[PDB]
Structures are given as structure tokens and as C-alpha cells.
Amino acid sequence: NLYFQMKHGRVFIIKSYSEDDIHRSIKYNIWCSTEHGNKRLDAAYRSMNGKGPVYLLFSVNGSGHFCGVAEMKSAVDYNTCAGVWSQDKWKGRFDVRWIFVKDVPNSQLRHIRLENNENKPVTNSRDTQEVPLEKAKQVLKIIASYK
């Protein structure tokens, strides 16, 4: 209702090519991004210093929908077993906590736009695109109220 109208938290889009990697993340509550993506999330997490959550909005590239919401729950460990994701393109791992597993079609979010990404729809983001807090509130309310 007015729950989401907090003033702390940072929100990022997660774009996965792999449906297998979504399933593994939900099963084991972990994730891994590119090197550049991990560094961005690790900085946001460490600078948050616990004063609020880091939310992750997951969407599989090409699927036409978002598939869930997770919260970051650790910094990035860069020295972990390799080859655990569906493509061996990844060094490291961080903990997440899946908060919401539901398919939300892009049609329900296309009209929200990111002033920090040339006003492109939030549904046209790349991996680890950060969402401004005020637009993030609108997306979460839509996700949590979809049926």
C-alpha cells in the first residue's frame, strides 16, 4: 500500500542468460556476476554498512519477464570453486536471500524509466544496472502486487 513509500537501500537489475543459474541461485542462495558486476555490487554492499538492504531484481535475458527478488547477504568472495555455474565464466560467489519468486511480465513495468540510463525503460536494462531508489519503490510495489 504505502509500505514502500524506507529511504535506505540500493537496487540493481540482474540479467541472467541462464535459466539453470537462476535455479541454482534459488536452491543454494548464492550468486555471481561478471567481474565488473561483482565489484559494483560489492561496493554497494560494503558502503551500505547494514543501514538498509541491497535488492536484486532478476530477469532472464530474452524471457520477457522478471522472475524474482533477492537481497544481497554477503560481500563478494572472489576465490571460490570454479565451474559451478552453467558456463565456466565466473570467479567468485556472494550470498543472496531470495525474497520473492514470481514471474512478472515486462508489460507491467515498461512504463517506469531510469533517469540514470537515458530514461530507458527499466525493462531494457543490462546486468547490474542500478535503479534509483524512487523508481525502485515503484517496481517493487508492482512486483509484490502482481497476480
Ligand SMILES: CCc1cc(=O)[nH]c(=O)[nH]1
Ligand atoms: C554466475 C551466474 C550468472 C549467469 C549469467 O548468465 N549472468 C550473470 O551475471 N551471473
